[PDB]
Amino acid sequence: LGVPRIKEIINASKVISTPIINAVLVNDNDERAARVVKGRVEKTLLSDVAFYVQDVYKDNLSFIQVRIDLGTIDKLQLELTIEDIAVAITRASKLKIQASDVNIIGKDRIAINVFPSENDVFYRMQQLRRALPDVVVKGLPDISRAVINIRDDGKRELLVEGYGLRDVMCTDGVIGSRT
Amino acid sequence: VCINELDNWNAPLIMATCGSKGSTLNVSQMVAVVGQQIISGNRVPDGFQDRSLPHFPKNSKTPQSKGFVRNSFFSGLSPPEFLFHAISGREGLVDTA
Amino acid sequence: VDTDLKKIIKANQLILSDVDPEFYLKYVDIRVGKKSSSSTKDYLTPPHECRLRDMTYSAPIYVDIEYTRGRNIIMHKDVEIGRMPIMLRSNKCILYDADESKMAKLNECPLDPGGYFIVNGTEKVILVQEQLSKNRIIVEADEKKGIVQASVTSSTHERKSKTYVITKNGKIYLKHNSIAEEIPIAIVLKACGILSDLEIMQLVCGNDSSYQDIFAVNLEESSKLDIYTQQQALEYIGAKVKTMRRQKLTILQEGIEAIATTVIAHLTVEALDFREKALYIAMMTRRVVMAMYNPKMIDDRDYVGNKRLELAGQLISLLFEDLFKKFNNDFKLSIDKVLKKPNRAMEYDALLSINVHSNNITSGLNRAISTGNWSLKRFKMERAGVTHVLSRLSYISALGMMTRISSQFEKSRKVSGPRALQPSQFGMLCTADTPEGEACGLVKNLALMTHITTDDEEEPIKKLCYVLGVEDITLIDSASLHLNYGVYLNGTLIGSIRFPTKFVTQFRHLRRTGKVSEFISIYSNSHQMAVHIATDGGRIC
Amino acid sequence: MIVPVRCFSCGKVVGDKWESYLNLLQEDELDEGTALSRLGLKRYCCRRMILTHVDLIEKFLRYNPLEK
Amino acid sequence: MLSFCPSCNNMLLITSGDSGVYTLACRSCPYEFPIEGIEIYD
Amino acid sequence: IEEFPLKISGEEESLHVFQYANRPRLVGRKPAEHPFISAARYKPKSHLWEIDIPLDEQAFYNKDKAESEWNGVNVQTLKGVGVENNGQYAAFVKDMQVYLVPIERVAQLKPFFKYIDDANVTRKQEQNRLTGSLLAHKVADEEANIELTWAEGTFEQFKDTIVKE
Amino acid sequence: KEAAAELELLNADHQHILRKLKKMNNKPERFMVFQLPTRLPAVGSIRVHKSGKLSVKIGNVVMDIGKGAETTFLQDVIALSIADDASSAELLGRVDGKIVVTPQI
Ligand SMILES: [Zn+2]
Ligand SMILES: [Zn+2]
């Protein structure tokens, strides 16, 4: 608020310290609309829906299968299927490994089929093991967190700390009138 | 409840009722009680491991141990109260120089 | 002048020559102002007369040297090799336990604090200066890049600081200013002696902590590089080294890194075959690995217990070490000029030519005090504004300057930390007397009942712990630190005695019978899982 | 250094009441209050002149430059 | 994986044995073990 | 309740301790399975221990790996450097009586790999002062001619410290 | 609360060496290791008390308690003898732990 914030504007810096975005809602429903509009925002929820990430070797191939439940999605509203998580793994990075193959089975497992200095298979398995539990699933990638806040009246207004303002304004649940 | 029991025709209550210098906070801090010397927004941190002064036990979040004076300036401060006031004084004293 | 002035000449006691191998000068004795059975320097100049004559107040240093010839004759002779400034009221001045009539006879006030030099007529004071703790481990954190660990080496000949930075992904690799593009620590402490991968995993992570998956990245890049011990491993650390030393340059196949992993670089440990240094770098790893999982377990630079106060005795010892190393170098190059040109061997003049080379050990020793520039060529800690002229505004001004501690800043742009009042200086430093201006909080003062200590021996304390029950580090398994608290002697690990409460109680009970108790102290630490014994003084109490 | 002739506030001569004060301190042993009370001054002004005064000239005359 | 050698206490890798079978075998010592592995962690 | 008397029992020889770092303990049935084949050597003046472990030619031998890169090998070399100590003693008890024996040295065995040195020394072509810590590393592999007959026997040692008392 | 572990766990290593000294006493070809302190007084022994503690009162009567050590011997430890560089490697062989003797003050 003080003298390092007036200089934050007079210098017109490209990156700033602690941004907020104040968005409003449409209806007057606290819990359900709060959870679904908050759940349409944050990213990298893969460390809460998987319970483990394991890698096994079956005699010519490798399984990096992930156990996605349905109980976490039941509590807080995330309108996604396992196909949406497969699309999220399909664009998990820009260009690292994620090109060739994924699979979809009945009880929600996605094992990345891989094919070959020497013996780079174990190195790819360790790097893809250590780069997987921070892969985003559903939400916006350039927003840290979100807090819904109560005013003096019975109104609920969410607020994020990101940088978009275009993909945040283009979001179902909120109105693009004022933010 | 100190300003209401304070008699009229005295200097600091008149100077708080009129203008130039002195408020109700200064006369309540001289007479009644000094309260909650804060630094950097929150209360005072742990100067040692798990505590601030070595005169209080570990994991003691009591007000007399973590930066709440209770004596006014007329009665006199205790040495942990004196150190807690000295920290908050030197904070505002170094932000001017 | 009683202990360290003899210790300096015991490291440069003998000189050589390139003319012949049968030439040596041997320093036997040294003392300040003492010649024969008479009194200690029968008449000096008084300290009041030299403040009016614009003189200095000094006593001569008398050394005794051995003098030889090819006729193998050996005798002794006392010579004067220069003046050394005497401080007021300390064991060499006239004003030591003087009577009140003696103070008025010599025109001196009996109530001045003393302790100040009187050089070139004017009164100079060497200030007390704080710095960080030498030979001890400090850990700092950062939000942007990552957590950085430092370890300042307190070696004599060189100034080292072995940094332990990380960049990304837990790719831990230590750095140095005498090493090129650096190497991850698996290869580094694999070159030190820890060769198994089972005990590079248990030593720094524990049994069932969350520390295992954090450190296990650095195992994965073990096979990415020169793995499979020292036919490849130590050679890769030796290949990326600075200070190539082209004199005998052929060593850089096996032996250029055995120079680097020993007393030349990175530390002050004098091990031949490395078990402690292989652990000390490995125990330096665990304090970072614990700080990655929990960012609360970090150290603060502003803590008073992390700092040491350097007094007026250490700086004069450094200056006299430098001017005595320069004294032998300017004299060796001036005595080989004369002992080569004629055919005969010169009997005299090898002792009678020292008076033209003893005027720079006197003028420089006064110049570095009167000016304030403690410029040492080998040491590289050039600081200005050390000595300050004694304030004589009033009586409380000349006394409050002899109590003053002046700290040094890094840069004056974004400091914000070492100007607030720390709660850890309760009764140690003055909580009121600070200057108002640019030096607000950077300049401090001592309280009444304090004492700055000295390093005593460091030798019998280590032999006393082994009596009390601790094992040596070469007798314990590498998979044993889920035990009780591990004893540290000035940062160096000793071997983790069981039941540390009884050890602390018996060590404090031995302290109260006589273990002389200026600084040799003990304190436990639960979050570090250790128990420290401190002997290396330079620290308040 | 020396006791002043007149007191600062009103101006009563207190320079005549220093040797007679030191005579009452050593012999006829009294406290400072009563021996300074039966000496003249009743007010606490001009009583402060004899009470809080340091005698520096007795220490200054030990550094006599005209003799040895 | 995080499996250690019972003979020399080193880190073992996953290699391809003559283009078509998988086995865990280090270059640290003459050791090989043809089992399949698990890398489950919470 | 009585005691069990300790004696210093004489000092005429030098003892040592292996203290292995590779094979801790088996799950049961008389563990730790110490081998028989080793028959190793010794070096003084740098103390340079070596001890050997036989391999398994029946299981997990990897006949392509053990004879492809390096030579056909059966030895598995360990290495340790001892250090002098004080106050350590050895103990053996016969039903009433504890015997202290000065043991004087403790080392740790670490498996230094020698065949990588043998492979790198082949694939290459296919000064009087050191002042501490380099003279010891230089003088390390000179004599080595103490290829030793690995013997046993509890009769020449138990009937060696009991005679004096 | 740290004084409770200085009396509860002392009733464990005293009973652990009591399960090691007299229970396995008959004839194992087997060695142990004691940690005696230096500057030894120039003997007395264990003196198992009334099912309590174990406290050595050594000869040269000044008194020296101490039992119990750590579990650092999870690894294999085997002692051996040596002669003058001609015959060595005559192992006895086992360690069954260690004890530490600490002089009380
Ligand atoms: Zn008056
Ligand atoms: Zn192995």
From Swiss-Prot, chain A:
It is found in: Nucleus. Component of the RNA polymerase III (Pol III) complex consisting of 17 subunits. Belongs to the RNA polymerase beta' chain family. Present with 6020 molecules/cell in log phase SD medium. DNA-dependent RNA polymerase catalyzes the transcription of DNA into RNA using the four ribonucleoside triphosphates as substrates. Largest and catalytic core component of RNA polymerase III which synthesizes small RNAs, such as 5S rRNA and tRNAs. Forms the polymerase active center together with the second largest subunit. A single-stranded DNA template strand of the promoter is positioned within the central active site cleft of Pol III. This is DNA-directed RNA polymerase III subunit RPC1.
From Swiss-Prot, chain C:
Signal peptide: none annotated. This is DNA-directed RNA polymerase III subunit RPC2. The gene is RET1. It is found in: Nucleus. Present with 1950 molecules/cell in log phase SD medium. The chain holds residues 69 to 609 of 1149 of the full protein. Component of the RNA polymerase III (Pol III) complex consisting of 17 subunits. Belongs to the RNA polymerase beta chain family. DNA-dependent RNA polymerase catalyzes the transcription of DNA into RNA using the four ribonucleoside triphosphates as substrates. Second largest core component of RNA polymerase III which synthesizes small RNAs, such as 5S rRNA and tRNAs. Proposed to contribute to the polymerase catalytic activity and forms the polymerase active center together with the largest subunit. Pol III is composed of mobile elements and RPC2 is part of the core element with the central large cleft and probably a clamp element that moves to open and close the cleft. It comes from the Eukaryota.
UniProtKB/Swiss-Prot annotation, chain E:
One of its GO terms (molecular function) is DNA-directed RNA polymerase activity. A zinc finger (C4-type) spans 5-29. GO terms for biological process: termination of RNA polymerase III transcription; transcription by RNA polymerase III; transcription initiation at RNA polymerase III promoter; tRNA transcription by RNA polymerase III. The keyword Iron does not apply. Its main location: nucleus. It is found in: Nucleus, Nucleolus. Coiled coil: none annotated. It comes from the Eukaryota. GO terms for cellular component: nucleolus; nucleoplasm; nucleus; RNA polymerase III complex. Zn(2+) 1 binds at residues 5, 8, 26, 29. Keywords: DNA-directed RNA polymerase, Metal-binding, Nucleus, Transcription, Zinc, Zinc-finger. DNA-dependent RNA polymerase catalyzes the transcription of DNA into RNA using the four ribonucleoside triphosphates as substrates. Component of RNA polymerase III which synthesizes small RNAs, such as 5S rRNA and tRNAs. Involved in Pol III transcription reinitiation and RNA cleavage during transcription termination. Belongs to the archaeal RpoM/eukaryotic RPA12/RPB9/RPC11 RNA polymerase family. Component of the RNA polymerase III (Pol III) complex consisting of 17 subunits. This is DNA-directed RNA polymerase III subunit RPC10. The lineage of its organism: Eukaryota, Fungi, Dikarya, Ascomycota, Saccharomycotina. The gene is RPC11. The chain holds residues 1 to 42 of 110 of the full protein.
UniProtKB/Swiss-Prot annotation, chain F:
It is found in: Nucleus. One of its GO terms (biological process) is transcription initiation at RNA polymerase III promoter. It comes from the Eukaryota. GO terms for cellular component: nucleus; RNA polymerase III complex. Keywords: DNA-directed RNA polymerase, Nucleus, Phosphoprotein, Transcription. Present with 1590 molecules/cell in log phase SD medium. DNA-dependent RNA polymerase catalyzes the transcription of DNA into RNA using the four ribonucleoside triphosphates as substrates. Specific peripheric component of RNA polymerase III which synthesizes small RNAs, such as 5S rRNA and tRNAs. The RPC53/RPC4-RPC37/RPC5 subcomplex is required for terminator recognition and reinitiation. Component of the RNA polymerase III (Pol III) complex consisting of 17 subunits. Interacts with RPC53/RPC4. RPC53/RPC4, RPC37/RPC5 and RPC11/RPC10 probably form a Pol III subcomplex. This is DNA-directed RNA polymerase III subunit RPC5. It comes from Saccharomyces cerevisiae (strain ATCC 204508 / S288c). The lineage of its organism: Eukaryota, Fungi, Dikarya, Ascomycota, Saccharomycotina. The gene is RPC37. The chain holds residues 71 to 262 of 282 of the full protein.
